[PDB]
Design a protein around this ligand. Structure first.
Ligand SMILES: COC(=O)Nc1ccc(-c2cnn([C@H](CC3CC3)c3ccc(-c4cc(Cl)ccc4-n4cnnn4)c[n+]3[O-])c2)cc1
Length: 237
């Protein structure tokens, strides 16, 4: 997260850190708890991943340095990538992780609601991106979960900024005209969370952008409301 600030413990309890363990253990991407056995993340995250055997899901983490050899994690039973995914910039950048066991919800690990049926025309004005990613284009994974409030931009404006890409209704963009706050490397798969009527909704999944927090170059997110039918089909199969 560029231009963000440190989170406190328990502030974003749906946020998980997905680790790979090959060839060494490290944060791979963010993700969001959406059900007791289900993490929603980005399909791009699994580009180098030989199987779910090497993945670990850590919940209730504020600092990456909390994770030691005895820290509990969830194994991953299945990675479900959207069958039309090819690369992040061409859309369908969405994946479900089915966990090997059920999360018991606590103060530190809670689900976030999907965008609600009937809310297709809500104007979200309180949206936040969170993650352990870089604070600038050449940086390092951050120890403490970072947060930044970021305004949504219309798909019409977003397309005008990304003349070489096809911005579709299955994407949503967010960014300041003058830059300065954005997701960056290591934030992908994490949530774009928006609060509406005091309820948090998983509006976006961090996906791609041209650089990090550049002027007139918004971040591009998977538009989760357009995948609710796909999520429900996979999670009640
Ligand atoms: C200690 O372990 C470590 O070093 N871990 C570690 C280090 C680096 C990485 C890393 C690098 N790339 N990515 C991803 C995609 C890869 C499949 C993971 C990525 C790409 C683009 C964006 C992004 C998103 C938005 Cl919305 C806006 C702008 C951008 N960006 C444009 N240009 N950069 N970002 C964010 N992410 O995350 C993650 C992962 C783990």
């Amino acid at each position: 997260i560029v231009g963000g600030t440190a989170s406190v413990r328990g502030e974003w309890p749906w946020q998980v850190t997905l680790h790979t363990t090959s060839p060494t253990q490290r944060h791979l991407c963010g993700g969001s708890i959406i059900g007791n056995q289900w993490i929603l993340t980005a399909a791009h995250c699994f580009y180098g991943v030989e199987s779910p055997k090497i993945l670990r899901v850590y919940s209730g983490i504020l600092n990456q340095s909390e994770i030691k050899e005895d820290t509990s994690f969830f194994g991953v039973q299945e990675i479900i990538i959207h069958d039309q995914y090819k690369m992040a910039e061409s859309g369908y950048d969405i994946a479900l992780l089915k966990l090997e066991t059920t999360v018991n919800y606590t103060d530190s690990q809670r689900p976030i609601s999907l965008p609600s049926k009937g809310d297709r025309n809500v104007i979200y004005t309180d949206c936040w991106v969170t993650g352990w990613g870089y604070r600038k284009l050449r940086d390092k994974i951050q120890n403490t979960l970072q947060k930044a409030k970021i305004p949504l931009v219309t798909n019409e404006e977003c397309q005008k900024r990304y003349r070489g890409h096809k911005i579709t209704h299955k994407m949503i963009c967010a960014g300041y005209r003058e830059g300065g706050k954005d997701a960056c490397k290591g934030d992908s798969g994490g949530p774009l969370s928006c609060k509406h009527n005091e309820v948090w909704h998983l509006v976006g999944i961090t996906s791609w952008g041209e650089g990090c927090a550049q002027r007139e170059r918004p971040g591009v997110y998977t538009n989760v409301v357009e995948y609710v039918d796909w999520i429900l089909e996979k999670t009640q199969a």
